[PDB]
């Protein structure tokens, strides 16, 4: 629940003529019940970071301390979703794909109820998707399958890499519902999303990367008010006008924003 990364940096293939400094001395604290948005350009290396935080790779020069530690059945409470869902598939049927986490960390219990509720809270009908091949689904349906497979066993840490990508409006409101219903449970969420504009109503703290370096680690409220706004979306610039004069735009419907801007 209390993931702390200490002077981590990671070097891909240290020895050969390439090395690549994916990460550059990253250190940040992410408390429980906190939702963190990992942002930055395409070279920043946020996916690398979330892979480390999820214990998928070993830093070549760092530690991530959960409360100390490593790896044991702490696995149990980590659930990372890859930005490309197919990079995560292994099963020939959607049911097996989703049921993995339950069958793995909880080999005693019947998975059918759990994977059922998991599937329907990403909008996938059970008797309609359970026996289909994951690879033979639409992009949005693949995204949903991934999300479901990593929320099925209710981990303490829910790491989502580009979870909005490929979903329709209904799919995105389903995802954000998931994020909320895991903040309510006092669980930790970690987000990568180029689309800050949507996620930010539901995020507590932003971190921004830059060639591995961390060039920002403020709060949500302190990111729209203290960060280079050259590349904000219109909505973000608007919320910015609303934070600068005193108000709290993170609680205004897409229309209430407008009214409070011109009228």
């Amino acid at each position: 629940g209390r993931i702390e990364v200490v002077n981590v940096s990671h070097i891909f293939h240290r020895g050969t003529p390439l090395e690549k400094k994916a990460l550059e001395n990253v250190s940040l604290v992410i408390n429980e019940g906190e939702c963190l948005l990992v942002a930055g350009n395409t070279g920043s290396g946020k996916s690398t970071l979330l892979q480390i935080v999820a214990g998928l790779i070993e830093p070549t020069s760092g530690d991530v301390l959960y409360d100390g530690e490593k790896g044991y059945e702490i696995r149990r409470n980590i659930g990372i979703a890859f930005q490309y869902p197919e990079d995560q598939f292994f099963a020939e049927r959607v049911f097996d794909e989703v049921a993995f986490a339950v069958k793995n960390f909880y080999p005693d219990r019947d998975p059918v109820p759990l994977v059922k509720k998991a599937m329907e809270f990403v909008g996938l009908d059970f008797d309609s998707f359970k026996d289909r091949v994951p690879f033979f689904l639409s992009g949005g349906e693949k995204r949903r399958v991934a999300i479901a497979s990593v929320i099925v066993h209710e981990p303490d840490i829910l790491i989502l890499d580009e979870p909005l990508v490929g979903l329709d409006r209904e799919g995105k409101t389903d995802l954000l519902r998931i994020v909320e219903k895991w903040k309510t449970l006092g669980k930790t969420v970690i987000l990568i999303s180029h689309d800050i504009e949507t996620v930010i109503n539901h995020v507590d703290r932003v971190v921004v990367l830059e060639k591995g370096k961390k060039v920002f680690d403020g709060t949500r409220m302190e990111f729209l008010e203290k960060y280079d706004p050259r590349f904000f979306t219109s909505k973000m610039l608007v919320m910015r006008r609303l934070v600068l004069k005193g108000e709290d735009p993170f609680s205004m419907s897409d229309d209430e924003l407008l009214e409070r801007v011109c009228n």
């Binding site: 891909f12 395409t42 992009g139 949903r144 409006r169 801007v261 011109c262």
Partner: protein, 247 residues
């Protein structure tokens, strides 16, 4: 130049139709944006356009009929997941790949599409170890190298940040001006500068097809309306963009 023409086109994967009697014309020089909820048939339509799927009904490329093998020969396609069209020990081998069928030229048509998508200097890197956004960039490049009359893109910039999305779309727009047909599937529409048409797909049929105004009017619920446009019709020109630089 040219013009694809779908007449009474329907498609089944195995079970029930995912496309039910589609009629359309896609003409060089204009740009078509395709929207609709998950499982509506956008990708299937697009693959039928690029000759990647054989569909029921008639499809004409310039008056004459066209099998998939002819359609492929004249529409470049970009996958939702770039990885399924990435192959080659390095990036230049990747771009080079569908310059399969010379070595002289087939090397800066390459680094032209690479400088175009913003991938210059990585041409000697294992494609497999690019970032997600850069893999997408790569796919765009390799399709552009083909130099097809039609560009069929299935959510091409769905993982670039909005500045990058905007710039890539400007590249596409340029290519629209040079007489290339452009059919674009996206869920964002946010980065879209201009468009000639918006098609909406409900459950296998093209529900709507007209101007952008007509689209924001009919009120569809499955498609997110850009905050920028909402902010355009009310408030009007408030010159918000100044905040990006503020002197």
């Amino acid at each position: 130049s040219g013009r694809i023409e779908l007449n009474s086109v329907s498609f089944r994967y195995n079970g029930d139709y995912v496309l039910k009697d589609v009629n359309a014309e896609f003409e060089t020089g204009k740009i078509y944006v395709v929207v609709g909820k998950n499982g509506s048939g956008k990708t299937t339509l697009l693959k039928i356009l690029a000759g990647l799927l054989a569909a029921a009904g008639e499809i004409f490329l310039d008056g004459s009929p066209a099998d998939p093998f002819l359609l492929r020969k004249n529409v470049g396609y970009v996958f939702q997941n770039p990885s399924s069209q990435i192959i080659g020990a390095t990036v230049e081998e990747d771009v080079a790949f569908s310059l399969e069928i010379d070595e002289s030229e087939m090397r800066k048509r390459i680094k032209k599409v690479l400088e175009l998508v913003g991938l210059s200097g990585l041409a000697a890197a294992d494609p497999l170890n690019l970032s997600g956004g850069q893999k997408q960039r790569l796919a765009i490049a390799s399709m552009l190298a083909r130099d097809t009359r039609f560009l069929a893109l299935d959510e091409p910039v769905s993982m670039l940040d909005p500045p990058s999305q905007r710039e890539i779309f400007q590249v596409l727009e340029s290519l629209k001006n040079e007489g290339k047909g452009i059919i674009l599937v996206t869920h964002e529409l946010e980065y879209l500068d201009d468009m000639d048409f918006i098609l909406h797909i409900s459950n296998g049929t093209i529900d709507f097809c007209g101007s952008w105004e007509e689209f924001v009017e009919r009120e569809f619920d499955d498609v997110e309306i850009p905050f920028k446009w909402k902010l355009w019709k009310k408030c009007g020109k408030i010159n918000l963009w100044e905040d990006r630089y503020e002197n």
